[PDB]
Amino acid sequence: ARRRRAEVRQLQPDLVYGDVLVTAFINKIMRDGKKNLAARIFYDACKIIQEKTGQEPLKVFKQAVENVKPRMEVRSRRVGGANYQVPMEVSPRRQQSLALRWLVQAANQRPERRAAVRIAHELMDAAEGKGGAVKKKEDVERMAEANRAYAHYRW
Amino acid sequence: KRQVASGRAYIHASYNNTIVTITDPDGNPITWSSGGVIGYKGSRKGTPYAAQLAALDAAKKAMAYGMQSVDVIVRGTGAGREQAIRALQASGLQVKSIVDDTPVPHNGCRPKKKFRKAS
Amino acid sequence: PSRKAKVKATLGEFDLRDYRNVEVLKRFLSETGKILPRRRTGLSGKEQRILAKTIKRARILGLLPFTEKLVRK
RNA sequence: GUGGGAGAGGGUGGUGGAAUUCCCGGAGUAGCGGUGAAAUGCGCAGAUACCGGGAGGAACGCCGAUGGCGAAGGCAGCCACCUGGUCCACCCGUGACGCUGAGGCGCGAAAGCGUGGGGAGCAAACCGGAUUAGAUACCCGGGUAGUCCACGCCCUAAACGAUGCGCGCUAGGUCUCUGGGUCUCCUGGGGGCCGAAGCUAACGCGUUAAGCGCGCCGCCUGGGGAGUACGGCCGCAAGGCUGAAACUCAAAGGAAUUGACGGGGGCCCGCACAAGCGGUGGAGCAUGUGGUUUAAUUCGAAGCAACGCGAAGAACCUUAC
Numbered sequence: 126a127r128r129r130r131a132e133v134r135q136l137q138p139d140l141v142y143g144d145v146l147v148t149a150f151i152n153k154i155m156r157d158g159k160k161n162l163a164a165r166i167f168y169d170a171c172k173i174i175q176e177k178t179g180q181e182p183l184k185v186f187k188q189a190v191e192n193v194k195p196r197m198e199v200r201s202r203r204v205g206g207a208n209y210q211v212p213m214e215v216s217p218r219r220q221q222s223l224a225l226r227w228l229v230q231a232a233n234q235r236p237e238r239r240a241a242v243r244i245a246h247e248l249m250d251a252a253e254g255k256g257g258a259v260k261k262k263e264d265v266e267r268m269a270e271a272n273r274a275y276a277h278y279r280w
Numbered sequence: 281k282r283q284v285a286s287g288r289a290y291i292h293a294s295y296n297n298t299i300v301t302i303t304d305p306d307g308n309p310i311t312w313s314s315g316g317v318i319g320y321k322g323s324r325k326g327t328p329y330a331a332q333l334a335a336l337d338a339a340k341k342a343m344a345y346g347m348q349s350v351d352v353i354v355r356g357t358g359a360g361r362e363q364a365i366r367a368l369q370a371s372g373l374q375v376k377s378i379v380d381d382t383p384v385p386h387n388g389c390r391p392k393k394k395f396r397k398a399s
Numbered sequence: 400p401s402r403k404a405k406v407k408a409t410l411g412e413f414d415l416r417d418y419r420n421v422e423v424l425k426r427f428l429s430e431t432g433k434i435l436p437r438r439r440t441g442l443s444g445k446e447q448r449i450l451a452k453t454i455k456r457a458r459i460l461g462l463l464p465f466t467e468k469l470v471r472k
Numbered sequence: 473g474u475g476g477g478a479g480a481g482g483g484u485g486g487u488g489g490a491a492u493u494c495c496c497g498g499a500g501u502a503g504c505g506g507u508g509a510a511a512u513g514c515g516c517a518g519a520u521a522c523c524g525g526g527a528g529g530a531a532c533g534c535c536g537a538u539g540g541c542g543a544a545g546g547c548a549g550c551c552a553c554c555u556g557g558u559c560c561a562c563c564c565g566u567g568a569c570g571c572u573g574a575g576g577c578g579c580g581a582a583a584g585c586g587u588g589g590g591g592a593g594c595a596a597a598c599c600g601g602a603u604u605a606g607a608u609a610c611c612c613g614g615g616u617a618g619u620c621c622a623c624g625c626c627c628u629a630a631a632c633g634a635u636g637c638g639c640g641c642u643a644g645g646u647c648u649c650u651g652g653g654u655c656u657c658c659u660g661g662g663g664g665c666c667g668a669a670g671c672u673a674a675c676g677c678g679u680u681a682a683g684c685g686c687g688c689c690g691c692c693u694g695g696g697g698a699g700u701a702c703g704g705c706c707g708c709a710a711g712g713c714u715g716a717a718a719c720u721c722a723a724a725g726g727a728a729u730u731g732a733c734g735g736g737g738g739c740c741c742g743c744a745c746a747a748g749c750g751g752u753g754g755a756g757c758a759u760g761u762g763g764u765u766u767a768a769u770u771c772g773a774a775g776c777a778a779c780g781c782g783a784a785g786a787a788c789c790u791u792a793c
């Protein structure tokens with residue numbers, strides 16, 4: 126991206142809830158371009174959040190993502206003699222990418238054999254405020270400001 | 281333990297650390313802090329953050345003594361010099377004033393080589 | 400910039416050689432006790448030169464300072 | 473000569489405030505310091521940071537200039553004394569009394585030397601810490617001579633404008649310091665810049681000549697050997713001044729040009745990095761290669777830009793062994 130400020134590629138609203146964030150997440154679940162098996166998976170998970178939660182799925186999802194968004198993160202930097210981990214706010218854009226990535230990442234790390242479950246459960250665990258996803262977020266922010274000594278290296 | 285509630289705040293900044301000293305109107309220190317005290321060692325101490333932390337330590341520790349209004353007096357141009365002044369102000373302590381007092385010789389002693397280069 | 404207003408303007412006829420006219424010399428010193436530049440005092444080479452020699456005498460008498468603390472910041 | 477002017481020009485005595493260090497008292501507590509990081513180091517026998525008092529040495533912030541003074545070296549806190557140079561005005565006096573200058577005599581930054589004194593900060597040597605492949609260095613902590621004063625000595629330098637001194641002549645513009653004037657500006661002395669003619673290898677110089685001329689002095693005659701040897705003179709010493717030869721090279725060198733280059737600068741690109749998704753590097757196998765082996769393992773390809781490459785087809789053939 127040396128020339129222009131790479132436009133934020135747009136996305137197609139959901140074939141159900143009609144939301145983009147859903148497609149976004151469904152995409153991160155998809156692997157080898159099997160957008161079907163991906164969508165199915167996510168959707169089955171939405172059913173399970175129902176068969177186990179009074180709230181609609183789409184609402185929980187939003188909730189999960191919301192907790193997993195790291196607001197501060199640290200970025201390595203060269204300081205004429207050393208590499209200092211510098212803390213700085215995480216842009217609204219990167220904020221969401223990180224959230225969705227982490228969810229799928231953590232989820233697929235759970236122990237339940239069925240893929241769809243892991244997502245449903247991870248989402249729920251995220252809604253509550255626990256779970257692997259939400260942890261990475263906590264670890265990240267932990268370092269951010271735990272290096273607040275270099276906040277003056279703005280960047 | 282004396283009940284002052286009105287004194288001075290010396291901020292000694294440098295490129296290596298920042299020590300803050302709170303004292304009574306006469307000039308006698310009540311309590312003090314520094315990047316070192318605050319917790320940082322060597323390199324970190326000079327950082328502007330340590331200065332914020334040490335500034336507040338000076339404040340807190342002095343709050344007990346009953347301190348309420350200080351007269352900030354900056355010295356040196358080290359980094360953190362400003363984050364200190366910053367903290368003191370927004371630490372309850374009513375900052376009555378700020379005053380640079382960094383000493384400067386009217387050309388007295390030959391500086392160390394590291395600081396010469398200026399004939 | 401120094402686009403203040405020149406100290407020589409805002410002032411009447413005065414003996415630049417007077418080392419006791421505190422009420423005027425003080426005008427040629429900064430926030431600190433530093434002697435003002437010509438781009439500020441509005442004087443001229445020869446004038447300025449005589450000013451310094453004067454301020455410095457004043458300073459030894461004790462009517463003028465060598466340096467003052469900077470307020471604000 | 474008379475009248476005026478500017479100046480860190482020199483010498484002596486005195487004196488002011490800021491800052492560093494040390495000492496004393498107070499208050500205060502666990503660190504300060506220092507670096508890319510660190511450590512050595514200093515601190516609970518209380519350091520650092522803060523206030524008050526004292527001692528001492530060295531240097532003078534702002535003014536300050538792109539400024540001024542001096543023959544050069546060089547000279548800046550303030551005051552007085554002693555003293556050099558110099559510029560302008562008036563046109564008053566002498567009447568060529570001028571220029572230059574081998575040798576001589578004097579002055580001559582720093583370091584260095586001698587005797588005595590002083591010594592705060594700084595700091596060769598040195599003692600340590602760190603860095604490094606090593607570090608007899610760069611960085612950090614200490615530190616003696618010295619740096620300071622007096623007296624004597626040394627006599628060097630990128631002692632530079634790398635431009636000897638004096639006089640005359642040859643467009644201007646502009647900025648500036650100091651004097652005069654009828655003070656829009658004219659005029660004299662000094663500092664800068666741009667430029668006529670002209671000069672120059674070029675760069676550049678250009679009324680502050682590197683132009684055009686005259687006078688006098690010094691100096692050069694390819695590079696290395698060599699500022700050495702010897703002699704002499706001077707020095708307390710260190711060493712200074714003068715200053716070769718044998719031998720040896722075809723160069724050594726000045727300026728400017730086009731490039732290339734830079735752990736130089738500015739501007740700008742590329743899946744270059746960053747962001748991100750998948751993978752190689754592990755395993756088994758496929759294939760090419762190195763090596764090794766063999767009677768032969770045909771040959772070529774080699775960092776990128778050789779290695780599933782020439783081989784889009786090796787059992788015989790192909791096939792070169």
Ligand SMILES: [Mg+2]
Pocket residue numbers: 564
């Ligand atoms: Mg006459």
Ligand SMILES: [Mg+2]
Pocket residue numbers: none
């Ligand atoms: Mg006659």
Ligand SMILES: [Mg+2]
Pocket residue numbers: 580
């Ligand atoms: Mg000498």
Ligand SMILES: [Mg+2]
Pocket residue numbers: none
């Ligand atoms: Mg000397």
Ligand SMILES: [Mg+2]
Pocket residue numbers: none
């Ligand atoms: Mg001596």
Ligand SMILES: [Mg+2]
Pocket residue numbers: none
């Ligand atoms: Mg030292």
Ligand SMILES: [Mg+2]
Pocket residue numbers: none
């Ligand atoms: Mg040293």
Ligand SMILES: [Mg+2]
Pocket residue numbers: none
């Ligand atoms: Mg002139």
Ligand SMILES: [Mg+2]
Pocket residue numbers: none
């Ligand atoms: Mg002139």
Ligand SMILES: [Mg+2]
Pocket residue numbers: none
């Ligand atoms: Mg011409």
Ligand SMILES: [Mg+2]
Pocket residue numbers: 674
């Ligand atoms: Mg040419």
Ligand SMILES: [Mg+2]
Pocket residue numbers: 678
């Ligand atoms: Mg010229």
Ligand SMILES: [Mg+2]
Pocket residue numbers: none
């Ligand atoms: Mg020869």
Ligand SMILES: [Mg+2]
Pocket residue numbers: none
């Ligand atoms: Mg010699």
Ligand SMILES: [Mg+2]
Pocket residue numbers: none
């Ligand atoms: Mg002898």
Ligand SMILES: [Mg+2]
Pocket residue numbers: none
């Ligand atoms: Mg280049």
